[PDB]
Amino acid sequence: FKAVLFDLNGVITDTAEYHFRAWKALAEEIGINGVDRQFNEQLKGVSREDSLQKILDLADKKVSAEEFKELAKRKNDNYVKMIQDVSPADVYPGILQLLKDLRSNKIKIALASASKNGPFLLERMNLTGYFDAIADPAEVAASKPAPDIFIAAAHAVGVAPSESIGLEDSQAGIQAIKDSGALPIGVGRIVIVPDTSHYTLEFLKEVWL
């Protein structure tokens, strides 16, 4: 194995709560009831545009293509203010060490997140240096569960998805990894780890075989 493709939220850190808060604020702003925690599970690793459609689907309010755009920027502007306080403190357990062990063992590291804020978040956590590249969700043809972002992360570091491990916390993201041809190891409640402190290189390798 040659590369590890990282989900961001759920793996490196998680800004899920800020994400939900900003979508809540938006839904309340547009009078669209019932965007709750239970609903927000449905939003993990989905792009901003996809997340909004699912919110908009609730009230079956069509908002012809320019409006839809704007509401996304509103939600983004809020969410961006909320994550100004991210720091190296929000690094998930065992992730720094893993990054370190990866790079020292000559395994490429790429970000395969659905989030356009991935680079900002990575910079705040002082993690930029570890990443050999970042899949641009702007360039990518479809969000998780499509494989496109994982294919793009692998390509960025000069590897096939088939020479890669993908690390994920949502089912759509697992599905995206599986279908890229890379190897999923998830974290949450078919290899599954209870938490990111079990994501050590020794484990990752032992799973490869």
Give the binding site for ligand B16 (CB under 6 A). 7-10, 19, 43-48, 51, 76, 113-117
**Across the strands, what pairs with 9?**
13
Quick check: 161 binds Mg ion (CB under 5 A)?
no
**Residues 45, 118, 137, 166: which binds Mg ion (CB under 5 A)?**
45
- Name the nearest CA neighbour of 76 among 46, 49, 56: 49
- Name the nearest CA neighbour of 77 among 36, 113, 118, 117: 117
Question: Residue 166 binds which entry of Mg ion, ligand B16, none, with Cβ cut-offs from 5 to 8 Å by kind?
Answer: none
Q: Where are the beta strands (DSSP E) in 130-188?
A: 133-134, 164-168, 183-187
Quick check: 9 binds Mg ion (CB under 5 A)?
yes
Number of residues that bind Mg ion (CB under 5 A): 4
Residue nearest to Mg ion (CB): 10
Question: Residue 134 binds which entry of Mg ion, ligand B16, none, with Cβ cut-offs from 5 to 8 Å by kind?
Answer: none
**Residues 4, 6, 10, 35: which binds Mg ion (CB under 5 A)?**
10
Token couple for 196: 């990111």
Q: Which is nearer to Mg ion, 92 or 130 (CB)?
A: 92
Quick check: 112 binds Mg ion (CB under 5 A)?
no
Token couple for 32: 């669209």
Question: Residue 48 binds which entry of ligand B16, Mg ion, none, with Cβ cut-offs from 5 to 8 Å by kind?
Answer: ligand B16
Question: Residue 13 binds which entry of ligand B16, Mg ion, none, with Cβ cut-offs from 5 to 8 Å by kind?
Answer: none
Rounded to 10 deg, the angle between the 66-82 and 16-29 helix axes is 130
**Residues 3, 5, 6, 7: which binds Mg ion (CB under 5 A)?**
7
Neighbours of 124 (CB within 10 A): 19
Q: Minimal distance in Å, beta carbon 169 to Mg ion? A: 5
Phi/psi of residue 168, each to 5°?
-145, 160
* Residue partners of 46: CB distance under 8 A and separation at least 6: 54, 114, 143, 144, 172
Residue 99: CA count within 13 A, CB half-sphere: 21
Question: Residue 183 binds which entry of Mg ion, ligand B16, none, with Cβ cut-offs from 5 to 8 Å by kind?
Answer: none
Question: Residue 116 binds which entry of Mg ion, ligand B16, none, with Cβ cut-offs from 5 to 8 Å by kind?
Answer: ligand B16
Interface residues with Mg ion (CB under 5 A) are 7, 9-10, 45
